Amino acid sequence: GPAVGIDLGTTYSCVGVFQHGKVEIIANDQGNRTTPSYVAFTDTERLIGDAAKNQVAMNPTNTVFDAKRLIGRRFDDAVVQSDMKHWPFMVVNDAGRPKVQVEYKGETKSFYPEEVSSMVLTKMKEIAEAYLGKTVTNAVVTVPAYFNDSQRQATKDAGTIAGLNVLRIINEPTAAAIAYGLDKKVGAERNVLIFDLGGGTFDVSILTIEDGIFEVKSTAGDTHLGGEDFDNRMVNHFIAEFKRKHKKDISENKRAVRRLRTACERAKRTLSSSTQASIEIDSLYEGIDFYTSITRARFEELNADLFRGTLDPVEKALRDAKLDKSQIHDIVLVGGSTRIPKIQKLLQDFFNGKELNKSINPDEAVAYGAAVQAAILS
């Protein structure tokens, strides 16, 4: 091709390419190394990635996201029925198969989850092509270790529809391990723990690797725990603050809340590198600007319980894998949320000081490994 590796994430997607013994994580048109798994429909155009997420606050009903939560599933599934209650866009039943329904160019249209995902993949494909200056066809796409045959098939279909020849569908934790060269043959078997906290899901996977062969020993986590939940805690904190300072409740103004969420998300990222962050929103509500700040300590307290709770699935995974902490040879951080210092501290403390593999941006680790594997398969 060269072939590329793509992490089609629940909230963010990332594409990499292995060239000259090195993996290049490819930045998009806006210079971002990861791209929102968002697609929006308007009276005149279809928006994808950054362009789509950048307008989610004003077009909530026609901006689709979380397509990965529906992919390969049946409409009657309990989880699908539960999730629908939280999404601002409509999900309809087409012969027992879920489809997202939106308005596009003034007409009602519906798309299968794989179609929405094919759009995101098309964007990743184009991002790679812009960088390489060549047509990209072959790719390795990743999926959660718990995905079944249907979910895997639908994900592969998303690739095909996007014009990609999916060389193989591999597990996200395995891709992360490959990124660190943990697939290399060293004689005896090794136990690796993948701690993956993204924007919407938390996955803990214990892999046993021997002779380059991976075995998923156990998996644990929470499909409804991620960075967005941390943003939410910050959002509530600031709604209360605005209310005290202006005796005005912004809760019912959907756009105001979404804009505050965006400001919180960015402030949160800054708190991973600094101990304080500034929030400066213009015309948040009724023309009132909201300029304030938040400390890392404050951010940690607001999420104390959620952070600490990530250790329960780690213990469960170890138990199911029938392994004690000391039997874990490597701990790999995956997901943008693992960049939070308090999380790293909790995990390291739990593992009695053991160092964490975190040199590769956690939110790029899966695509990194996928790119390596893609090169191998080509």
Distance CA 17, CA 217 (A): 29
Is 265 one of the annotated binding-site residues?
yes
Active site annotation includes 315? no
Residues that bind Mg ion (CB under 5 A): 9, 198
Cα–Cα nearest to 8, from 49, 46, 40, 37: 37
Give which of K ion, Cl ion, Mg ion, none residue 29 binds (C-beta under 5 to 8 Å, depending on kind).
Cl ion
CB proximity list for 42: less than 8 A, separation 6 or greater: 59, 62, 104
Give the residue with the Cβ less far from ligand ADP, 3 or 25.
25
DSSP 265-328: HHHHHHTTTSSEEEEEEEEEETTEEEEEEEEHHHHHHHTHHHHHHTHHHHHHHHHHHT--GGG-
Residues paired with 210 in a beta bridge: 213
Query: Catalytic pick from 7, 114, 183, 231?
Result: 7
Active site annotation includes 184? no
Give which of K ion, ligand ADP, Cl ion, none residue 28 binds (C-beta under 5 to 8 Å, depending on kind).
Cl ion
Query: Catalytic pick from 83, 172, 222, 363?
Result: 172
Q: Supply the DSSP symbol for 311.
A: H
Q: Judged by CB under 5 A, which of 50, 114, 183, 203 binds K ion? A: 203
Which two structure tokens, joined as six digits, stand for 296? 């890392």
Give the residue with the Cβ less far from Cl ion, 67 or 124.
124
Query: Catalytic pick from 53, 68, 156, 342?
Result: 68
Is 11 one of the annotated binding-site residues?
yes
Give which of Mg ion, Cl ion, ligand ADP, none residue 16 binds (C-beta under 5 to 8 Å, depending on kind).
none
- Under the binding rule (CB under 6 A), the answer on residue 269 touching ligand ADP is yes
Instruction: Give the number of other CB atoms < 10 A from CB of residue 345.
Output: 12
Tokens 């924007």 belong to which residue? Answer: 199
Is 258 one of the annotated binding-site residues?
no
Amino acid at 162: A
Reduced to 3 states (helix: H, G, I; strand: E, B; else coil), residue 371 is helix
- Under the binding rule (CB under 6 A), the answer on residue 66 touching ligand ADP is no
Active site annotation includes 7? yes
Residues 313-372 that bind K ion (CB under 5 A): 335
DSSP 3-16: -EEEEE-SSEEEEE
Active site annotation includes 68? yes
Distance CA 170, CA 355 (A): 26
- Under the binding rule (CB under 5 A), the answer on residue 28 touching Cl ion is yes
Strand order in the sheet with 63-64: 46-48, 39-41, 63-64
Closest contact distance (angstroms) between CB of 201 and K ion is 4
Give the residue with the Cβ less far from Mg ion, 256 or 374.
374
Which two structure tokens, joined as six digits, stand for 345? 């501290």
Q: Judged by CB under 5 A, which of 83, 183, 196, 231 binds K ion? A: 196
Is 292 one of the annotated binding-site residues?
no
Residues paired with 52 in a beta bridge: none
Reduced to 3 states (helix: H, G, I; strand: E, B; else coil), residue 92 is strand
Query: Catalytic pick from 196, 222, 231, 363?
Result: 196
- Given the rule CB under 6 A, which residues bind ligand ADP? 9-12, 34, 198-200, 226-228, 265, 268-269, 272, 335-337, 339-340, 363
Residues marked active site are found at: 7, 68, 172, 196
Residue list, annotated binding site: 9-12, 68, 199-201, 265-272, 336-339
